[PDB]
Amino acid sequence: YLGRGAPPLLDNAAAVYLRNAVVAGNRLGPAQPLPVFGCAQVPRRAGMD
Amino acid sequence: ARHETGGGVNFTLTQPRGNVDLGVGYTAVAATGTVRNPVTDMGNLPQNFYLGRGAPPLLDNAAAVYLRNAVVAGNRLGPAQPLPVFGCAQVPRRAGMDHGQDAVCEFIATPVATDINYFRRPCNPRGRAAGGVYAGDKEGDVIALMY
Amino acid sequence: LLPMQRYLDNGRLATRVARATLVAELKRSFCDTSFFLGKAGHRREAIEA
Amino acid sequence: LLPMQRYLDNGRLATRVARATLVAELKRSFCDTSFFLGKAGHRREAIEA
Amino acid sequence: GYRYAAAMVPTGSILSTIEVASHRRLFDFFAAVRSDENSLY
Amino acid sequence: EDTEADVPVTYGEMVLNGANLVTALVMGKAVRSLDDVGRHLLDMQEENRETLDELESAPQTTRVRADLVAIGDRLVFLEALEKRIYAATNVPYP
Amino acid sequence: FTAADITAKHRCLERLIVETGSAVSTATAASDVQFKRPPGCRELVEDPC
Amino acid sequence: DVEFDALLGSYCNTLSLVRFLELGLSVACVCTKFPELAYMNEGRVQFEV
Amino acid sequence: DGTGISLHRQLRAIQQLARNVQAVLGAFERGTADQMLHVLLEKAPPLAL
Amino acid sequence: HQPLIARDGPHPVEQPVHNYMTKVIDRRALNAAFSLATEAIALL
Incomplete structure (x- = not known):
């Protein structure tokens, strides 16, 4: 779910359902709710191989 | 000329030395090529947790003393005359040893429904990378990947 | 040693990827x-390599 | 005796562990x-060795 | 190296020419210096 | 390509002579070869690069049983030593 | 399984590899089982694990 | 008793100079000088073939 | 101050300055050679195609 | 003294750098055997 330009659904309950249902623990799931100005803030992992 | 111990000290002569790494890089290194003999054996020898005191026992004391010798009947790692207050368990000595030093096969409970693909690799046996290599020096990531 | 000696040179910064690829290699x-x-014990070439 | 010398090619050990690994080799x-x-006898350059 | 006026005679071969201190940093004292620093004088 | 020529004389001497010995007990200071580096730094005073680190005499060499190999470019020495100096003691080999 | 000891290590690579050339194990090559290392002795293991 | 501390010799590198003509690459270049570049402002070759 | 402390101090700065100026004199000698390869790789498509 | 390379264009200016470090000795002294009985030092 980017802040570029994606028309949301009608039901406001449906969107915050599914967006949070999609973004649970993805490595590209952003940490905080997204600012207007600034990047999407990909959360830094602790370690990588 | 040290302390006279009877019929003379007998006259050692020690010498001081010392050495630095006269070289700014990885001078003079190393290799590894042969396999002589596998000193401790590939072995079947299990782990005994009754070797040490670590836990509150059963409160049903009739049960635990039944299970006391039930486990530690005749383990090669099973003591006789069990634990005093302070001291080691004094693992007994078998009359002969053939192949080499003995192994310790410690066990950790796993669910059955993982991949066998994990363990077809040199992987961390705890199930998650844990060493202090992968962290990125942000002062908190070490325990973060751990737990 | 030999994997490290090609990397004594450059990077090793916020290119921390290159620290991780140092590890995986x-x-x-x-x-x-x-x-x-x-x-x-028979590959006469590879030992001399 | 070809393992007997390379047992003695150490300090010495009687600690009952090296005695076992002497025998098992x-x-x-x-x-x-x-x-x-x-x-x-079909080979060569091992009878050399 | 620590006493700089001692190193005015090098009396030996600076010979390896490999990337110093990207190695083991095993040195008890070493200073990665640019063109100048006031403590040299 | 064997039996090369190296020094038998064990490598030189540092003695705490009058250059050192005066600085030794009176101040507690010690400088390796204070002779030249005192001399040279007295003369550059009347007008680092100290290339007199160790090149004086090139002392006497003799001929020993030595085994050299040609690993590509380099002339590399190679000796194995158990029977030489690790033989028959209770010291392990490294 | 030690929360302190892996966390106790540094991460400057220069000192990491040279400890692998001479580390001290927790095992003992002078005992019938793996007796955990007696506090007065050295071992000088390699130990990549 | 006496008790001194010691500076036991120190060793400096001798950094090397490189003439680029004293290097095999300069057959691919034509090292030609021009002491008045900063006013030349342009250049061309009209290449009749 | 007309003392031997001063002339050692005076000569040290020049033994840095000469050591400093010899660095940048070798730098454009190096840096030209560095620049020698860059325009040769702006051209020269690889061998395969 | 790590030398530098004059890098061209919109790049940071590489200073002439310097490196000064020190090292210390260790000691690790060696040991020697005792060998002397009685009456070799005396006579009858």
Whole structure:
């Protein structure tokens, strides 16, 4: 779910359902709710191989 | 000329030395090529947790003393005359040893429904990378990947 | 040693990827090139390599 | 005796562990390479060694 | 190296020419210096 | 390509002579070869690069049983030593 | 399984590899089982694990 | 008793100079000088073939 | 101050300055050679195609 | 003294750098045997 330009659904309950249902623990799931100005803030992992 | 111990000290002569790494890089290194003999054996020898005191026992004391010798009947790692207050368990000595030093096969409970693909690799046996290599020096990531 | 010596040079900064690729290329080598004399006892070329 | 010398090619050990690993290699060298000439007479540059 | 006026005679071969201190940093004292620093004088 | 020529004389001498010995007990200071580096730094005072580290005499060499190999470019020495100096003691080999 | 000891290590690579050339194990080559290392002795293991 | 501390010799590198003509690459270049570049402002070759 | 402390101090700055100026004199000698390869790789498509 | 390379264009200016470090000795002294009985030092 980017802040570029994606028309949301009608039901406001449906969107915050599914967006949070999609973004649970993805490595590209952003940490905080997204600012207007600034990047999407990909959360830094602790370690990588 | 040290302390006279009877019929003379007998006259050692020690010498001081010392050495630095006269070289700014990885001078003079190393290799590894042969396999002589596998000193401790590939072995079947299990782990005994009754070797040490670590836990509150059963409160049903009739049960635990039944299970006391039930486990530690005749383990090669099973003591006789069990634990005093302070001291080691004094693992007994078998009359002969053939192949080499003995192994310790410690066990950790796993669910059955993982991949066998994990363990077809040199992987961390705890199930998650844990060493202090992968962290990125942000002062908190070490325990973060751990737990 | 030999995997490290190609990387003494550059990077090793917020290119921390290059620290991680240093690692993933390292552990593969130690599984590979140890007891090489002994892993190869007939490959006359590879020992001289 | 070809393992007997390289047992003595150390400090010395009587700690009952090296005594076992002496024997468990000694029986393998006799079970495998005892009659080597004639066992491998088809070869060459091992009878050299 | 620590006493700089001692190193005015090098009395030996600076010979390896490999990337110093990207190695083991095993040195008890070493200073990665640019063109100048006031403590040299 | 064997039997090369190296020094038998064990490598030189540092003695705490009058250059050192005066500085030794009176101040507690010690300088390796204070002779030249005192001399040279007295003369550059009347007008680092100290290339007199060790090149004086090139002392006497003799001929020993040595085994050299040609690993590609380099002339590399190679000796194995158990029977030489690790033989028959209770010291392990490294 | 030690929360302190892996966390106790540094991460400057220069000192990491040279400890692998001479580390101290927790095992003992002078005992019938793996007796955990007696506090007065040295071992000088390699130990990549 | 006496008790001194010691500076036991120190060793400096001798950094090397490189003439680029004293290097095999300069057959691919034509090292030609021009002491008045900063006013030249342009250049061309009209290449009749 | 007309003392031997001063002339040692005076000569040290020049023994840095000469050591400093010899660095940048070698730098454009190096840096030209560095620049020698860059325009050769702006051209020269690889061998395969 | 790590030398520098004059890098061209919109790049940071590489200073002439310097490196000064020190090292210390260790000691690790060696040991020697005792060998002397009685009456070799005396006579009858």
